[PDB]
Amino acid sequence: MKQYLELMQKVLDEGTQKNDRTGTGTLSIFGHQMRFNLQDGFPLVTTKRCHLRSIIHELLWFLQGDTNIAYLHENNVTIWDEWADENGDLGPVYGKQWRAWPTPDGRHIDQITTVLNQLKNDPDSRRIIVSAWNVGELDKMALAPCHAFFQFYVADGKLSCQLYQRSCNVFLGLPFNIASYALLVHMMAQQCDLEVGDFVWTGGDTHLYSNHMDQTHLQLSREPRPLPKLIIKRKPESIFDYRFEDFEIEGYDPHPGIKAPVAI
Amino acid sequence: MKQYLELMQKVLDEGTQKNDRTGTGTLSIFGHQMRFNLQDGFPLVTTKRCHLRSIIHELLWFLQGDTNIAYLHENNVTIWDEWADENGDLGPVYGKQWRAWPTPDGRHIDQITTVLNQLKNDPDSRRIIVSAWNVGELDKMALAPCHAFFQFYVADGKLSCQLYQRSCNVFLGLPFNIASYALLVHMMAQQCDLEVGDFVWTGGDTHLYSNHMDQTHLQLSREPRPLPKLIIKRKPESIFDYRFEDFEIEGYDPHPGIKAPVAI
Numbered sequence A, B: 001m002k003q004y005l006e007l008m009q010k011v012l013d014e015g016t017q018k019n020d021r022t023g024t025g026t027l028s029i030f031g032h033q034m035r036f037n038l039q040d041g042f043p044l045v046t047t048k049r050c051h052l053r054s055i056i057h058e059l060l061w062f063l064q065g066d067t068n069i070a071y072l073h074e075n076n077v078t079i080w081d082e083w084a085d086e087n088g089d090l091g092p093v094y095g096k097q098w099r100a101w102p103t104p105d106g107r108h109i110d111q112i113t114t115v116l117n118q119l120k121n122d123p124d125s126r127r128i129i130v131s132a133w134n135v136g137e138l139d140k141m142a143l144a145p146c147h148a149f150f151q152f153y154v155a156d157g158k159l160s161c162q163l164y165q166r167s168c169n170v171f172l173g174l175p176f177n178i179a180s181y182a183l184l185v186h187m188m189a190q191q192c193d194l195e196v197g198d199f200v201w202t203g204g205d206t207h208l209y210s211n212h213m214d215q216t217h218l219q220l221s222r223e224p225r226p227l228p229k230l231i232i233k234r235k236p237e238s239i240f241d242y243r244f245e246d247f248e249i250e251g252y253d254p255h256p257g258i259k260a261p262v263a264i
């Protein structure tokens, strides 16, 4: 996508070389924002082929309030294998925080249910937010939440959403994150009888790992193709009742996939 | 300021009329980001007179982990009066979360200290974050946190900070918010022997109240003057040891003030 490629070029041209936790090294910039009008099409990168199966199943896994990769394995998803323990658990990550944020007094908060009820009963609210950044449980998580906090918005019957990603791997993670959230927006909109609006992505440490330079340069020469369209085959009883078989990506003609190692 | 005035013009040009909690009515846009190079000068609005007295005392109050307005009162600052109860309490708001975020296992995390330790020992970390958005205690707060999340970054020996403000009252609150955080960066930088970098402001529901339109247009007809200079006269033992007297703002020649009502 245009916005995406522009960010890549920006990182290359303005990035500062930074030594990081993985000891790999990165070209890094701080503070960036991009908007995706969802009416124009599903923001799925076409400059390289993206794997929808992994994107969809992970999101359904989140809404389940699940933190064990068992589910992902049943569906041949391995994106979280490098961080799961001997038993497949990742600690109280995303899923746990979304569906059952632990209060100091022992109670639990279902942020998704709250959001649904807010969108349905009080759309003008400026407090429709879901946070995965539970300071009190960060030590128990296998990896700190990258896409840590998001806010919904409603105007003229359209549902928008802004995501704050504290850390971003432009080449590997960013394409996955965009599509994942854009998908959530569509699911929320359908469940709340609202049209889709804009997906606003805001990031903190936006970077490109040194060992991805060639891949990036290759992708930057490929002209972006028209954006695909998402089709939701069925309207479930609730936001928690979606199945992988309910989504269709029409008109997705991407360029060949580009391989690159992951940093652990 | 240029960025500030341009934001106001954007809200007016692309804002949607929207009803709100206070029952006042607002013009609103969702998603915005602007950057302030702190080396250029202290980002204090000159198109209208602002009063440091309240900005500084509030920040010091925050750092103390204080949530009762008694302190503010002793120093003749009334900005928070309308939301405090009979005992002057506001609930576990900013100060409390910053200095003692409650964990489910009985612990309390001092986010400010954690950040200081990170800036010195691991400045390349992509997790240097302070969050006031405590989902589990929002119900005990007098008002949900507007400026609820911020991340620090270091590059070229300069300290930058990005703030995510979920809700923003462009005319009243923003001028305070910008100066408050720019001040925090200066204090942090001095304590970590770093230079000041950029303050990146990101907003969710950025709006202007219907009853602030004339004030807004009056301000827009003014030419921004040179930015003031911040002079810290002392280097305290810790970030929690600063006093009002330690700060000196010079070169501040602002336009006349423009009074406007606060939405409760």
Ligand SMILES: C#CCN(Cc1ccc2[nH]c(N)nc(=O)c2c1)c1ccc(C(=O)N[C@@H](CCC(=O)O)C(=O)O)cc1
Pocket (backbone or CB within 6 Å): A050, A051, A054, A078, A079, A080, A143, A169, A172, A173, A174, A176, A177, A258, A259, A260, A262, A263, A264
């Ligand atoms: C974001 C996010 C979720 N995640 C989780 C996640 C967790 C830690 C991380 N750590 C680092 N350094 N970078 C990441 O992008 C990253 C991503 C992802 C995990 C793997 C792939 C990945 O390797 N992509 C392959 C396809 C693999 C497959 O489908 O089997 C690709 O080349 O596209 C992408 C995203």
Ligand SMILES: C#CCN(Cc1ccc2[nH]c(N)nc(=O)c2c1)c1ccc(C(=O)N[C@@H](CCC(=O)O)C(=O)O)cc1
Pocket (backbone or CB within 6 Å): B051, B054, B077, B078, B079, B080, B143, B169, B172, B173, B174, B176, B177, B258, B259, B260, B262, B263, B264
């Ligand atoms: C941000 C922040 C902190 N806050 C707290 C705070 C709490 C609730 C809010 N509610 C609304 N609707 N808008 C706000 O900006 C807002 C701000 C502020 C509160 C009041 C003033 C204010 O009254 N401004 C007057 C000066 C009054 C004085 O000197 O005491 C002005 O004319 O500017 C500024 C900031």
Ligand SMILES: *c1cc(=O)[nH]c(=O)n1[C@H]1C[C@H](O)[C@@H](COP(=O)(O)O)O1
Pocket (backbone or CB within 6 Å): A021, A143, A144, A145, A146, A147, A167, A168, A169, A170, A173, A174, A177, B125, B126, B127
């Ligand atoms: C985390 C998970 C995700 O969905 N998307 C991402 O981009 N990431 C990345 C960010 C960074 O590349 C790597 C490590 O982050 P950190 O060292 O813990 O700060 O994961």
Ligand SMILES: *c1cc(=O)[nH]c(=O)n1[C@H]1C[C@H](O)[C@@H](COP(=O)(O)O)O1
Pocket (backbone or CB within 6 Å): A126, A127, B021, B022, B143, B144, B145, B146, B147, B167, B168, B169, B170, B172, B173, B174, B177
């Ligand atoms: C809150 C506190 C501050 O620092 N600055 C701000 O702009 N605000 C504003 C946001 C909004 O106008 C009002 C809070 O109302 P709500 O919770 O968003 O409904 O104060």
